[PDB]
PDB file of C-alpha atoms in Angstrom:
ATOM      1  CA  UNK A  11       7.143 238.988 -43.826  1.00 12.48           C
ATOM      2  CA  UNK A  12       5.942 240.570 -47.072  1.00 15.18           C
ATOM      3  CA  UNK A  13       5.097 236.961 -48.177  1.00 14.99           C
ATOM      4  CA  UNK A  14       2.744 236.524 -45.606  1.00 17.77           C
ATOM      5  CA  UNK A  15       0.744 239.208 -46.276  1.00 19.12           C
ATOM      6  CA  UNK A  16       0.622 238.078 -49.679  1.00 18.29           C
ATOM      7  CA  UNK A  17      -0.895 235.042 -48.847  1.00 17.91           C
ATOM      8  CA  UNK A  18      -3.049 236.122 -46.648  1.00 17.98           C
ATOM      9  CA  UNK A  19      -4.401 238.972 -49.093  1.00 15.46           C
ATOM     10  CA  UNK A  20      -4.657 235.380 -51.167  1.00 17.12           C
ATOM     11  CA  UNK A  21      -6.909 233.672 -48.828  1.00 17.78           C
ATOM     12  CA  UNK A  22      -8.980 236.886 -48.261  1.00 18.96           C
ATOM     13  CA  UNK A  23      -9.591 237.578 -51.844  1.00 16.95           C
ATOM     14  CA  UNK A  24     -11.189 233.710 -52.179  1.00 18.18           C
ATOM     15  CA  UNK A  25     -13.503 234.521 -49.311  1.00 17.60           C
ATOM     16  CA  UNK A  26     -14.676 237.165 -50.535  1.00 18.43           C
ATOM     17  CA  UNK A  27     -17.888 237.124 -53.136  1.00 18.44           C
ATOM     18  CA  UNK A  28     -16.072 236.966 -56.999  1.00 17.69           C
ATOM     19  CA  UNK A  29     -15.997 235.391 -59.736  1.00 17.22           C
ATOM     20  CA  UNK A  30     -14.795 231.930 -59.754  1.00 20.49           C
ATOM     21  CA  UNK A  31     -11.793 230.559 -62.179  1.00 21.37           C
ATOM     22  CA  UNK A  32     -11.621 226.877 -62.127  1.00 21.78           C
ATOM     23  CA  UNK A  33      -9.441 224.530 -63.606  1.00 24.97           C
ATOM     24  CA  UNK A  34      -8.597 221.067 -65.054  1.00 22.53           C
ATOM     25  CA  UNK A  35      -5.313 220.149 -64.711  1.00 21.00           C
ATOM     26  CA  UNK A  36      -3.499 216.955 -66.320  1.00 23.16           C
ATOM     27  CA  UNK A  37      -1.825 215.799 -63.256  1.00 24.33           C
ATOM     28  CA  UNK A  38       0.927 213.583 -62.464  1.00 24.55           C
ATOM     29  CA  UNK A  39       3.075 213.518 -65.803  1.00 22.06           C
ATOM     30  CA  UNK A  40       6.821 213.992 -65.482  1.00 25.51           C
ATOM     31  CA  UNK A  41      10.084 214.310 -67.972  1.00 25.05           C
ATOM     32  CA  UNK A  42       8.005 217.411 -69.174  1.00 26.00           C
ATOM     33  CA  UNK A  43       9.139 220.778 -67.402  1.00 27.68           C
ATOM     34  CA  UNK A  44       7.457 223.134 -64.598  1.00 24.90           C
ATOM     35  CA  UNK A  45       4.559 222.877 -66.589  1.00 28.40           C
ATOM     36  CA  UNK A  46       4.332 218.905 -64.912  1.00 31.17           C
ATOM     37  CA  UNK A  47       3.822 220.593 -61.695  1.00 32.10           C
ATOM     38  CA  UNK A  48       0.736 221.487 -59.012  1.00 28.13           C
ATOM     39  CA  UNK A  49       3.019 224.118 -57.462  1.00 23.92           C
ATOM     40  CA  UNK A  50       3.183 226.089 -61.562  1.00 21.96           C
ATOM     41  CA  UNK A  51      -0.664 226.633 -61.031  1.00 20.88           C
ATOM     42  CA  UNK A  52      -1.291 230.743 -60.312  1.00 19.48           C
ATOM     43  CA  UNK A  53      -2.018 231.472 -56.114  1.00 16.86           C
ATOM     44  CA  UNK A  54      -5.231 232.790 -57.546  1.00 16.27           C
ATOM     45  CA  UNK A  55      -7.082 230.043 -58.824  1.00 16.78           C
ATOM     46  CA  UNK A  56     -10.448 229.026 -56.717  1.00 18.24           C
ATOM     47  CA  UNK A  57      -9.747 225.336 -58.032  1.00 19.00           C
ATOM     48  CA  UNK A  58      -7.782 222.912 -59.841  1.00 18.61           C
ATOM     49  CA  UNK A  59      -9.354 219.508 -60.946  1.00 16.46           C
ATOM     50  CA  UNK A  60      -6.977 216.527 -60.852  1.00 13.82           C
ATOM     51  CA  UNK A  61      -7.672 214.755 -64.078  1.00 14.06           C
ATOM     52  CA  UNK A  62      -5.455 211.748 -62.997  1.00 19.20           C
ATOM     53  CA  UNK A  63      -6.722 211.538 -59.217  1.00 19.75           C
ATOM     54  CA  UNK A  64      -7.028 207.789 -58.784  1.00 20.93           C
ATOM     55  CA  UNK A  65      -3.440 207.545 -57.306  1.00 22.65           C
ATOM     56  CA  UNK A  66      -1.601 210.542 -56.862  1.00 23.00           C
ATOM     57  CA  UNK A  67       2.528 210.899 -57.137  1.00 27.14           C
ATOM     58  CA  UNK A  68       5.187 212.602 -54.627  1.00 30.20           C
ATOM     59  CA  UNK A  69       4.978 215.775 -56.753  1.00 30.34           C
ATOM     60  CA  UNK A  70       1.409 216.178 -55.908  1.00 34.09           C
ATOM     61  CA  UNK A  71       0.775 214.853 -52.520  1.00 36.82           C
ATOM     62  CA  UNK A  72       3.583 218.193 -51.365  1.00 36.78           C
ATOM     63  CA  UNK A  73       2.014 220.213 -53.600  1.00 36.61           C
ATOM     64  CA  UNK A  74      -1.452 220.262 -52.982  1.00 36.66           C
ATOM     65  CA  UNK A  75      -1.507 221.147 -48.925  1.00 33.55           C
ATOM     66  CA  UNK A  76       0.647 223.816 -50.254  1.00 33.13           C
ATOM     67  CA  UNK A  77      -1.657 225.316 -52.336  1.00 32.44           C
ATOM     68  CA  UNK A  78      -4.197 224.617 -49.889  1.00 30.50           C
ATOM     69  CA  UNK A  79      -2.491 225.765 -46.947  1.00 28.42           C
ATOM     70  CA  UNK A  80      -1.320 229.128 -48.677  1.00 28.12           C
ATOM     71  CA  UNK A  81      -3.513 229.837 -51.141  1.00 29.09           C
ATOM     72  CA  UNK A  82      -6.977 228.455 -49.999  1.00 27.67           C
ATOM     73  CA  UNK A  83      -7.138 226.273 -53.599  1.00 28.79           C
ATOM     74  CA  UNK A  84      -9.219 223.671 -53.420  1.00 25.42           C
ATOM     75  CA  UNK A  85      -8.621 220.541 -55.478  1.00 29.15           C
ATOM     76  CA  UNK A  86     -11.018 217.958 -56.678  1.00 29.86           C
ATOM     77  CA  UNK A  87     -10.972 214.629 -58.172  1.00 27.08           C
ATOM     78  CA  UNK A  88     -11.625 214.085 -61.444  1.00 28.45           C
ATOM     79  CA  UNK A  89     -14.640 211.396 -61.799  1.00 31.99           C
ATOM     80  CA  UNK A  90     -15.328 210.316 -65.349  1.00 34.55           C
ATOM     81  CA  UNK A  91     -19.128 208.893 -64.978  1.00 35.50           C
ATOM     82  CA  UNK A  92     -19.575 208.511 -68.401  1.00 38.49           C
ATOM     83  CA  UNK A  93     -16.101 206.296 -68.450  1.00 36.46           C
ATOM     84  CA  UNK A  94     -18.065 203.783 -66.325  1.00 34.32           C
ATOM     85  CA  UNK A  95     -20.936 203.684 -67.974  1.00 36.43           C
ATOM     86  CA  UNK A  96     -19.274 202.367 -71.314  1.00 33.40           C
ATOM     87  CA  UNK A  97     -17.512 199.835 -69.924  1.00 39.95           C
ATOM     88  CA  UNK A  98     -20.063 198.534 -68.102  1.00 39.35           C
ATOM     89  CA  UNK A  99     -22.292 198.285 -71.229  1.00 40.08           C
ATOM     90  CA  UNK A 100     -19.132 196.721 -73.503  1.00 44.35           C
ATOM     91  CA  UNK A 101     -18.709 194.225 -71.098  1.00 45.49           C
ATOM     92  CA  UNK A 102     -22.294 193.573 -70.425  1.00 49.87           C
ATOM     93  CA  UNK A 103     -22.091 194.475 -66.750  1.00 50.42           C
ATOM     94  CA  UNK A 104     -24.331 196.397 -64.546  1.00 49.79           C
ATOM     95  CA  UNK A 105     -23.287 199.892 -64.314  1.00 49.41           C
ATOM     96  CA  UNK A 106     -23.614 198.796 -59.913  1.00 49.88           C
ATOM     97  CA  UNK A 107     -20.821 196.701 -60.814  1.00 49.38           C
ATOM     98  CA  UNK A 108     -18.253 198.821 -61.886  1.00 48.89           C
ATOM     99  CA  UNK A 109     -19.525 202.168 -60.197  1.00 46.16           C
ATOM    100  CA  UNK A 110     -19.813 201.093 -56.480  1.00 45.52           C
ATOM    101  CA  UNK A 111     -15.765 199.985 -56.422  1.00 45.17           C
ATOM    102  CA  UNK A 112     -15.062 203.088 -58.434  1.00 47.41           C
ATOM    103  CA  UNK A 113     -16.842 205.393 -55.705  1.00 50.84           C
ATOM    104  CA  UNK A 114     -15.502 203.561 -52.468  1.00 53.55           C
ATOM    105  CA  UNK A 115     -11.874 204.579 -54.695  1.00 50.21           C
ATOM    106  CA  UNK A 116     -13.321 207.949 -55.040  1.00 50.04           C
ATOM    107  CA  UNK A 117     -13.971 208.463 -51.545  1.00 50.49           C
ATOM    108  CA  UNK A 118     -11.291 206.671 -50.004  1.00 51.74           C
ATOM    109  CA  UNK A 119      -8.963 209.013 -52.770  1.00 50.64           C
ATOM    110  CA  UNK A 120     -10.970 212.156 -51.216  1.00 53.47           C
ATOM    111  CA  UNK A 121     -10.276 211.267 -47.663  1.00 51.11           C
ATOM    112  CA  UNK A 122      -6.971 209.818 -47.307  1.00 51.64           C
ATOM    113  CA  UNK A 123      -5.252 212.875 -50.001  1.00 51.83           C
ATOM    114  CA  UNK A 124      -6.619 215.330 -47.920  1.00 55.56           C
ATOM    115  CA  UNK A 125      -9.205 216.446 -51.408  1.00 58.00           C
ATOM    116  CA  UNK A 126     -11.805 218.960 -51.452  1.00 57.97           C
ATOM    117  CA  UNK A 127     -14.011 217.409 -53.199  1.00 60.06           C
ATOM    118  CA  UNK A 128     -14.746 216.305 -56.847  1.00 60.63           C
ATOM    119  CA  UNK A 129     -16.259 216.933 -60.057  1.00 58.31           C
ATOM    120  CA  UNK A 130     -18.522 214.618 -61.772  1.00 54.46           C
ATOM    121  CA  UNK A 131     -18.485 214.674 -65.721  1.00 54.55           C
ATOM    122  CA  UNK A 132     -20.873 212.832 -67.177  1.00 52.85           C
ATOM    123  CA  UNK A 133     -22.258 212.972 -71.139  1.00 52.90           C
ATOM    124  CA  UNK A 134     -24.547 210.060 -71.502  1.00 51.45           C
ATOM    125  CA  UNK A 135     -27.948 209.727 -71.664  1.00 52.97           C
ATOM    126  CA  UNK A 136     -30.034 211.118 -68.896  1.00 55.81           C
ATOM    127  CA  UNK A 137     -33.304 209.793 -68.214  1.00 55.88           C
ATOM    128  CA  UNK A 138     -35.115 211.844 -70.159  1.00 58.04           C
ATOM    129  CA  UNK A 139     -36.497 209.801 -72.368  1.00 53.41           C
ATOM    130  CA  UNK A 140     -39.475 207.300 -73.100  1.00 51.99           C
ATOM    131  CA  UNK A 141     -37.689 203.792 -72.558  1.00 53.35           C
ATOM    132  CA  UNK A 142     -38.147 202.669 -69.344  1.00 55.48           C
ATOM    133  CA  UNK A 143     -35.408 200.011 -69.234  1.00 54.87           C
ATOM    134  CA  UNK A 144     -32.782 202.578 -69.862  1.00 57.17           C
ATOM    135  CA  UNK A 145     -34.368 205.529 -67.461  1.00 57.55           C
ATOM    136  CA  UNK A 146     -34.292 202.677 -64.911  1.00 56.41           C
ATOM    137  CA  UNK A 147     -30.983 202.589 -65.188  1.00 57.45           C
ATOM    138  CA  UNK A 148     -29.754 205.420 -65.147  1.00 55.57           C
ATOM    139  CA  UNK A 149     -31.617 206.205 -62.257  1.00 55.95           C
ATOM    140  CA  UNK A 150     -30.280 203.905 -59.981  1.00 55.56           C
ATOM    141  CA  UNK A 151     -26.787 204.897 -61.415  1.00 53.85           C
ATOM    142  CA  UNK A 152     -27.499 208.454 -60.223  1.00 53.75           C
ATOM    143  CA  UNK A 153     -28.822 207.025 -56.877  1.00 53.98           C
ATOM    144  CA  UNK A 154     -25.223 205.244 -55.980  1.00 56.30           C
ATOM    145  CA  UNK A 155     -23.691 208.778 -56.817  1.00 56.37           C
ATOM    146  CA  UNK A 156     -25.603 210.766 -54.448  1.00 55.15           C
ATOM    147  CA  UNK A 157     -25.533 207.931 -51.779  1.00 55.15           C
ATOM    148  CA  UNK A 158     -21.991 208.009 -51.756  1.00 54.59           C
ATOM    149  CA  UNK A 159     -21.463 211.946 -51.885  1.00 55.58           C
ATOM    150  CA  UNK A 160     -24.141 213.052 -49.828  1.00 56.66           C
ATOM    151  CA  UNK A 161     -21.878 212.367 -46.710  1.00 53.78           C
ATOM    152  CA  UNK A 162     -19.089 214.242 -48.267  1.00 54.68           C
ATOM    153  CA  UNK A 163     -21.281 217.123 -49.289  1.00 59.47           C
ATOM    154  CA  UNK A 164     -22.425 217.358 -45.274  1.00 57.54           C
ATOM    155  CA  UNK A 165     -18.830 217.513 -44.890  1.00 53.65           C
ATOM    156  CA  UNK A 166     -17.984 220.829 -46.442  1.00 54.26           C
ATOM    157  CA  UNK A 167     -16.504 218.641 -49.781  1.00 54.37           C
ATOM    158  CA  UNK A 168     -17.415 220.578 -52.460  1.00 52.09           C
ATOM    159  CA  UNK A 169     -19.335 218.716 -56.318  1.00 50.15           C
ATOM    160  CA  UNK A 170     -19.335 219.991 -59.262  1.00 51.59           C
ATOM    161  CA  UNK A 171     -21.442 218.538 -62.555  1.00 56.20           C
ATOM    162  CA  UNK A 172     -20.089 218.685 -65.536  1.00 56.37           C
ATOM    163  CA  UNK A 173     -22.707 217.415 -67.467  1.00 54.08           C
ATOM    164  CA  UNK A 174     -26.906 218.364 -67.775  1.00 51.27           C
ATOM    165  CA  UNK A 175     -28.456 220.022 -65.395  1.00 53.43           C
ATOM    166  CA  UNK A 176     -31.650 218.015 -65.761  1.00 53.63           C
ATOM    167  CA  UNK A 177     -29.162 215.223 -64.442  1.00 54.42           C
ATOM    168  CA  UNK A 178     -30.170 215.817 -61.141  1.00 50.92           C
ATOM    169  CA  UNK A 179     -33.855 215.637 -59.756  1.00 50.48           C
ATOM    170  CA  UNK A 180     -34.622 218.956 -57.972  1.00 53.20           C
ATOM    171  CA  UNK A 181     -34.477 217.392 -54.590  1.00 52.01           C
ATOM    172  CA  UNK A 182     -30.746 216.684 -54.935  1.00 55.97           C
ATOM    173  CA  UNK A 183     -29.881 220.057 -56.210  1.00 53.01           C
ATOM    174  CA  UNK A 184     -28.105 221.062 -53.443  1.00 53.61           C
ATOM    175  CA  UNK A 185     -25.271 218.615 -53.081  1.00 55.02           C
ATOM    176  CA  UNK A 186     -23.590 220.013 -56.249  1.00 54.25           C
ATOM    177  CA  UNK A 187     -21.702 223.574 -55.123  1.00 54.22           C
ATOM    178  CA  UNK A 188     -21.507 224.136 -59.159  1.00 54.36           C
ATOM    179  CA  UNK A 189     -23.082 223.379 -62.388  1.00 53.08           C
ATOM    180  CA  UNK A 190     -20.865 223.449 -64.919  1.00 55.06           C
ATOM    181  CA  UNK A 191     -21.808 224.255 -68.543  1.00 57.92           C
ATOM    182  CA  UNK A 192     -19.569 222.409 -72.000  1.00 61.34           C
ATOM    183  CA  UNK A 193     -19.496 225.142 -73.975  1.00 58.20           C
ATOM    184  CA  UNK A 194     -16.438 224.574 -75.683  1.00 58.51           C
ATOM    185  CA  UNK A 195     -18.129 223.762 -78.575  1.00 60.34           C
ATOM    186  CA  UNK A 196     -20.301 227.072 -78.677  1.00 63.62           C
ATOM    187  CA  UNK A 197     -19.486 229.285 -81.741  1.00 62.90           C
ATOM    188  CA  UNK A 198     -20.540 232.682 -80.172  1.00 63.21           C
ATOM    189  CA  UNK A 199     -21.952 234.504 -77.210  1.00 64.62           C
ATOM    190  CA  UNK A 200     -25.583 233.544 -78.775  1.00 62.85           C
ATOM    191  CA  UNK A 201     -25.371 230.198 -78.430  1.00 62.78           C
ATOM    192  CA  UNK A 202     -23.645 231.144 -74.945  1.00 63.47           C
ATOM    193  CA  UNK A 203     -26.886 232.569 -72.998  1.00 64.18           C
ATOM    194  CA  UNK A 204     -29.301 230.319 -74.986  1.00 66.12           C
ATOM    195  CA  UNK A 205     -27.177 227.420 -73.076  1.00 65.73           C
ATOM    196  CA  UNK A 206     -27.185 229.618 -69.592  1.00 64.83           C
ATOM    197  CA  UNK A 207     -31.145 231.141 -69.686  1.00 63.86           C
ATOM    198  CA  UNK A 208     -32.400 227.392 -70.633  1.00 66.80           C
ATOM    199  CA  UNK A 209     -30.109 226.035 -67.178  1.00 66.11           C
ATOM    200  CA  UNK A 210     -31.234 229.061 -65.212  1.00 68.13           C
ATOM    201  CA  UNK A 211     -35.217 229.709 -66.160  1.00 69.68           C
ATOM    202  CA  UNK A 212     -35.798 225.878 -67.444  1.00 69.63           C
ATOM    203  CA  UNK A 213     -33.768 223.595 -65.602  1.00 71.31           C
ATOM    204  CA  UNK A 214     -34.152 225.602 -62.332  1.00 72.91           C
ATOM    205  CA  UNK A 215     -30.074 226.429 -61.248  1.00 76.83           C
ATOM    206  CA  UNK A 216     -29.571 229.829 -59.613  1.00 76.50           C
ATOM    207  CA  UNK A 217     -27.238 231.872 -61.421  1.00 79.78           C
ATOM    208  CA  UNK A 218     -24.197 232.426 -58.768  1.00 82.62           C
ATOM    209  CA  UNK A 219     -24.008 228.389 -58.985  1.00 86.35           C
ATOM    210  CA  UNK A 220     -23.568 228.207 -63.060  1.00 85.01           C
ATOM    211  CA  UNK A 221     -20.185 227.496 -64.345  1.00 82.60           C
ATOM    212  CA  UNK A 222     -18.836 227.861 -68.329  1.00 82.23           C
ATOM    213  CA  UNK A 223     -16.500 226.514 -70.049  1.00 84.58           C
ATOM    214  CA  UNK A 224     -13.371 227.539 -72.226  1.00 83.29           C
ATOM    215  CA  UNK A 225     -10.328 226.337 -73.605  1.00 84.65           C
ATOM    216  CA  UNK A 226      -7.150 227.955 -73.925  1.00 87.09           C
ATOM    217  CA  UNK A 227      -6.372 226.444 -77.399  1.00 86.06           C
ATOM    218  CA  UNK A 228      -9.720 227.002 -78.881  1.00 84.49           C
ATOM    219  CA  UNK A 229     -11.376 229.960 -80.879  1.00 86.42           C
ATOM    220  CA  UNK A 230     -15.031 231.512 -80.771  1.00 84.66           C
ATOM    221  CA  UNK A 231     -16.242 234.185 -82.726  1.00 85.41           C
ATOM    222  CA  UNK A 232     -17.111 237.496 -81.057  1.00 82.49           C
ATOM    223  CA  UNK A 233     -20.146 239.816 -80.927  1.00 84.59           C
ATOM    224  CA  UNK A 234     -17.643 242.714 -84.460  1.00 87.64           C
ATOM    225  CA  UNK A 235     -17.855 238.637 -85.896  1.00 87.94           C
ATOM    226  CA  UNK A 236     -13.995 238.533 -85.030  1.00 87.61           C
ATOM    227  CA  UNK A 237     -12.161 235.359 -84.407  1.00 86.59           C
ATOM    228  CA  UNK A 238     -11.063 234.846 -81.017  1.00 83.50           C
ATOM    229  CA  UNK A 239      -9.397 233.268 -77.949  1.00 81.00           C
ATOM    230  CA  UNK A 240     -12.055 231.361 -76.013  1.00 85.21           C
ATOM    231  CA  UNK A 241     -11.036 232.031 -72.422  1.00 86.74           C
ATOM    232  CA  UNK A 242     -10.595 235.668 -72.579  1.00 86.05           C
ATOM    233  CA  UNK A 243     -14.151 236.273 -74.455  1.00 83.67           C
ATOM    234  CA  UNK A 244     -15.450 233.636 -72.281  1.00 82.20           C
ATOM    235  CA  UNK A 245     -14.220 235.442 -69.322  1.00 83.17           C
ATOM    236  CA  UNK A 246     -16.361 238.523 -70.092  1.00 80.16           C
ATOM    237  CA  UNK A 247     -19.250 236.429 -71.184  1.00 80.70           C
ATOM    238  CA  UNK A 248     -19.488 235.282 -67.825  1.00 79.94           C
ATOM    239  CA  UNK A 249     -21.072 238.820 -66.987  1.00 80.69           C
ATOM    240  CA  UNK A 250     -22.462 239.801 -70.668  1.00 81.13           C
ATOM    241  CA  UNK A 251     -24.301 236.401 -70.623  1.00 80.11           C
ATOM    242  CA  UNK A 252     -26.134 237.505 -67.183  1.00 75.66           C
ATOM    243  CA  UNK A 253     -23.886 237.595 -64.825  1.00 74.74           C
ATOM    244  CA  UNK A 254     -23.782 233.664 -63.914  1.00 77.58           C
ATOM    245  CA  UNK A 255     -20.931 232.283 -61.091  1.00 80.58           C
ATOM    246  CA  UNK A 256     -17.415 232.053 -62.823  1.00 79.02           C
ATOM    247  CA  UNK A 257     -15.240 230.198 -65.919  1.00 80.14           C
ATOM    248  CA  UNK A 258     -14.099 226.615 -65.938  1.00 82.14           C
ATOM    249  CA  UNK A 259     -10.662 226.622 -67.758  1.00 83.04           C
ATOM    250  CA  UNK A 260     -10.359 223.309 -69.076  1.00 84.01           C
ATOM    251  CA  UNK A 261      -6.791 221.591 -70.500  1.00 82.21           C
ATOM    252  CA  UNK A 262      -5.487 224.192 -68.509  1.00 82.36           C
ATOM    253  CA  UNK A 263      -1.705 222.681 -69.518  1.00 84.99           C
ATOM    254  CA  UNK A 264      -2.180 224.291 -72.688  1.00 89.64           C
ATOM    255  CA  UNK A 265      -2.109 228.081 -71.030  1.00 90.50           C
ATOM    256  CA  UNK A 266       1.387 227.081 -69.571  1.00 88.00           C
ATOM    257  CA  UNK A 267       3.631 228.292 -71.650  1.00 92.54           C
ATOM    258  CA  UNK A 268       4.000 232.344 -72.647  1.00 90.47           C
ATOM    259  CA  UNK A 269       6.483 234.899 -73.529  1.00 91.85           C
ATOM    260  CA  UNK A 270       7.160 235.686 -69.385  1.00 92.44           C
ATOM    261  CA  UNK A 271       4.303 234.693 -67.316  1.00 92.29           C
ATOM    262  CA  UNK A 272       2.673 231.273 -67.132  1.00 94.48           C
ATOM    263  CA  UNK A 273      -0.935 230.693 -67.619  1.00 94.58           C
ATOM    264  CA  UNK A 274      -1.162 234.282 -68.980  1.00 92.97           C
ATOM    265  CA  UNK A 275      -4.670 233.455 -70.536  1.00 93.34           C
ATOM    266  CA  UNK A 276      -5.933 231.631 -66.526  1.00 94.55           C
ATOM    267  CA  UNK A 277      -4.341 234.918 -65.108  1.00 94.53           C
ATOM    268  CA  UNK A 278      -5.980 237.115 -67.497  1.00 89.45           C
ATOM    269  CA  UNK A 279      -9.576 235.829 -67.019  1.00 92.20           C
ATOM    270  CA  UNK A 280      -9.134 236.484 -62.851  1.00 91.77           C
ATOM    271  CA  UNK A 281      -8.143 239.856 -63.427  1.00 91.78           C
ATOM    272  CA  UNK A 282     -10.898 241.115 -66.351  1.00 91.79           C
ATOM    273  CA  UNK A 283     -13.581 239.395 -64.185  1.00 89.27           C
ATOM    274  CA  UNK A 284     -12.242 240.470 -60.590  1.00 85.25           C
ATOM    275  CA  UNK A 285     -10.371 243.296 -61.198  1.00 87.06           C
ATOM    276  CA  UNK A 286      -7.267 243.661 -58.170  1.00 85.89           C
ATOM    277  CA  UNK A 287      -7.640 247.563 -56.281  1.00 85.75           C
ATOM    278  CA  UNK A 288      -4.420 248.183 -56.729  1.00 89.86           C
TER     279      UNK A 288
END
């Protein structure tokens, strides 16, 4: 079959050293169209990140060994770190209290969904600072993470942090597979490699592990002082910016819907950074 040299050509192109194109999908909606859907994601993407991953539906529990199975996509469970630590503090818990339940959930959501992993966001304070109560704290929140993911990460599960670098002492470095950059809020590609050289040369992360990221309903202005699409200039900013590991495509949803093709902009990014031979 044609198809399954398609597929194939799929799985081989992911092997392969490129580019990566990740993205975070709003899972698990319905009464919307396709666009509700695993199975609408491009065969192409390295990764999609299940925003709603807690409990998954019928539509995604077919849908993701498909894309796994064909297409060699890996999805991840969304974990909102930061999510935890508020509620914890309005409620005048320890963070141990709500975190440890949430990560067993985590895990046990990983291994019984078949997942591939997860990515941790997290935009709270980071221990930087001068009080010890709080970097106390926020230590021994980052301890329960890496106790519980560790195992995974031995595992072949694949981590990505979406949040600071500095985050993570330099002796855990290696359980996160990516390091993933917010630059949706960066206004050109100058505030682009000040945000990539001080992750690289400061906070230590090689290059080929660096992740940025765009949004498909956001603007940026480029280097002619232009207004334009994030993803696309992000895409080629990826290389311009030193060439750093790939593009996280966040609200991915939004890219859906297009003249003929869905998730032209997702699409578009693959090709301009890993261009096909043919």
């Amino acid at each position: 079959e044609l198809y399954a040299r398609y597929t194939q050509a799929v799985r081989n192109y992911k092997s392969r050293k490129h580019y990566a194109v990740c993205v975070r999908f709003d899972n698990g909606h319905s009464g919307d169209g396709e666009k509700d859907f695993l199975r609408s994601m491009p065969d192409s993407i390295d990764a999609v990140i299940l925003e709603n991953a807690a409990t998954l539906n019928s539509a995604d529990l077919e849908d993701i060994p498909v894309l796994q199975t064909n297409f060699a996509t890996k999805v991840l469970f969304s974990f909102n770190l930061t999510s935890i630590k508020e509620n914890a503090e309005s409620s005048g818990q320890e963070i141990k209290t709500l975190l440890a339940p949430a990560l067993e959930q985590m895990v046990s959501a990983i291994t019984d969904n078949g997942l591939d992993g997860a990515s941790i966001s997290y935009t709270g304070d980071i221990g930087l600072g001068n009080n010890a109560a709080v970097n106390a704290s926020i230590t021994e929140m980052r301890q329960l993470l890496l106790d519980k993911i560790t195992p995974l990460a031995k595992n072949g599960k694949i981590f990505f942090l979406e949040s600071n670098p500095l985050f993570i002492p330099e002796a855990n470095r290696d359980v996160f597979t990516r390091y993933v950059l917010n630059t949706t809020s960066s206004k050109n590609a100058s505030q682009l490699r000040l945000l990539i050289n001080e992750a690289i040369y400061y906070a230590g992360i090689p290059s080929d592990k660096l992740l940025i990221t765009g949004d498909p309903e956001l603007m940026t202005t480029d280097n002619n002082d232009g207004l334009v699409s994030q993803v696309p200039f992000f895409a080629i900013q990826v290389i311009d910016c030193g060439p750093i590991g790939g593009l996280m495509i966040q609200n991915v949803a939004a890219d859906y819907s297009h003249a003929n093709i869905t998730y032209k902009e997702t699409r578009g990014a693959i090709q301009t950074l890993n261009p096909s031979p043919l």
